[PDB]
């Protein structure tokens, strides 16, 4: 039962609840961490920035697996099907480590363009018969 990540203003953060911090014991925290932390880009990839720095984590060489997802390569894209295909592939690659274990049975992710300027990703998992009920929230804005 670790801390839960709560999204406000488009940026997630840990939150409190009564005495201590809010706790989570479901796949929600695992998915929202495996999807939205930048992992190291390959040697041959072209970064969206004009820079030469690739993200990652100092613990990537201590945790037996790269941490997050390569969705940050699509920071600045135009409305073309290539970006949608790449986003679908990147989400699949980021979340396939769950299917490798027994924590999920199947993954179905699709990419689409909703109301102009929206990169919509629909990711549907298949939790097994014994998995606990996952957490439930929505992104919120204030001020």
């Amino acid at each position: 039962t670790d801390l839960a990540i709560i999204w406000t203003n488009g940026r997630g953060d840990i939150a409190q609840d009564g005495i201590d911090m809010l706790t989570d014991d479901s796949l929600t925290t695992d998915v929202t961490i495996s999807l939205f932390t930048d992992r190291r880009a390959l040697d041959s990839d072209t970064l969206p920035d004009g820079s030469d720095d690739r993200r990652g984590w100092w613990g990537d060489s201590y945790r037996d697996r790269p941490i997050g997802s390569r969705l940050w390569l699509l920071s600045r894209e135009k409305a073309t099907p290539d970006t949608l295909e790449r986003a679908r592939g990147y989400a699949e690659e980021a979340l396939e480590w769950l299917k490798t274990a027994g924590r999920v049975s199947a993954i179905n992710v699709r990419a689409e363009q909703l109301h102009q300027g929206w990169l919509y990703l629909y990711i549907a998992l298949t939790l097994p018969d014994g998995s606990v009920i996952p957490y439930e929230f929505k992104a919120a804005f204030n001020g």
């Binding site: 039962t1 670790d2 801390l3 409190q16 005495i19 201590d20 911090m21 706790t23």
Partner: protein, 356 residues
């Protein structure tokens, strides 16, 4: 004095509660409590490392290597070990040549090796000088000891008896002795003409255990020195010892710089020896036994060795404390020393025979 682990737990919990208002990290089985405990463990390890970094600033509580480095920096020099040597009187049976490097081992295991080759042309005993390889206090032996032969020679009897034993076996000074010398050096600074300077000068010469210096002994231009050697049975100087100590104070080379240092040219030192002034106590013991005889005697001897100075007066209470330090006895009333005994600087107090 590093904080304890429970204090570190409390400090981390207080920090967490202060930074996150309205929270109580002390709750059982909670994320903040677990985080606080882990951070407290890490901080305890760090504080222990800090404590080990400390405690080596001073040579007294430093570890071994740091103590040796401190002594080397401060200028204390060690004395290297020696090696024993002596005659062997080995017996042969015909003309033979004992090759250089042969070894004679004693029962204990110590090995003595011949240095130079020896050629023998008779069937009789021959005396050769051998030196030990151990190079330590165990090298020297008694008067008539036996040494076997590790590997046989052409025509030499394996056994070898030394009529006059080996001598010259010493040990390298220990870290405790080095620390004591450094502590003495720091405690009593060198000035070149001070009373502590004269005491350390009279103590540096070999064989001397204690010394005392009286400034302005016989006027405003002279001093006085009086030393006592406690290793020897007499425990009182001889004319040869006095003249050699005077020579050492007059002039001796400094091992550090290589220049010779000594007393000023205008002062009169005139080092001399003390005169015994014995006191004979009369202590009554309830159980009269040889063990209590030895214990009381040794306590009194040590009491004098500690708190007796030439020219000083010893109170009768000292004897009482020394005799009360023993365990087995029940009553220890003293009868002779009922008044304070005092003496002049030439007179040195000493414990005479006790009349039980």
């Amino acid at each position: 004095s590093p904080p304890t682990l429970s204090s570190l737990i409390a400090r981390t919990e207080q920090n967490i509660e202060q930074r996150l208002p309205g929270s109580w990290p002390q709750a059982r089985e909670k994320t903040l409590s677990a985080i606080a405990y882990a951070q407290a463990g890490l901080a305890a390890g760090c504080h222990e490392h800090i404590s080990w970094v400390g405690r080596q600033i001073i040579p007294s509580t430093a570890d071994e290597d740091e103590l040796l480095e401190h002594c080397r920096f401060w200028g204390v020099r060690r004395k290297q070990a020696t090696a024993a040597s002596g005659p062997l009187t080995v017996t042969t049976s015909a003309a033979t040549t004992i090759p250089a490097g042969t070894r004679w081992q004693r029962a204990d295991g110590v090995v003595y090796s011949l240095a130079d080759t020896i050629v023998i042309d008779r069937a009789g005993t021959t005396e050769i000088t051998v030196t030990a390889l151990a190079a330590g206090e165990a090298g020297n032996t008694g008067e008539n000891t036996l040494l076997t032969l590790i590997t046989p020679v052409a025509c030499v009897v394996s056994d070898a008896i030394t009529v006059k034993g080996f001598s010259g076996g010493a040990d390298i000074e220990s870290a405790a002795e080095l620390l004591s010398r450094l502590e003495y050096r720091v405690q009593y600074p060198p000035f070149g003409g001070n009373q502590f300077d004269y005491v350390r000068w009279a103590r540096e010469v070999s064989g001397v255990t204690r010394a005392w210096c009286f400034p302005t002994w016989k006027g405003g231009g002279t001093v006085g020195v009086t030393f006592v050697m406690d290793n020897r049975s007499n425990i009182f100087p001889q004319p040869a010892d006095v003249e050699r100590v005077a020579d050492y104070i007059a002039g001796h080379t400094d091992p550090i710089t290589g220049l010779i240092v000594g007393q000023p040219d205008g002062v009169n030192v005139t080092v001399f020896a003390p005169k015994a002034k014995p006191v004979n106590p009369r202590i009554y013991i309830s159980p009269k036994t040889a063990e209590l005889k030895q214990a009381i005697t040794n306590a009194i001897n040590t009491m004098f060795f500690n708190e007796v100075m030439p020219g000083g007066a010893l109170a009768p209470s000292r004897i009482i404390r020394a005799v009360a330090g023993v365990t087995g006895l029940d009553d220890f009333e003293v009868r002779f020393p009922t008044e304070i005994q005092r003496s002049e600087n030439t007179e040195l107090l000493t414990a005479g025979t006790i009349e039980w």
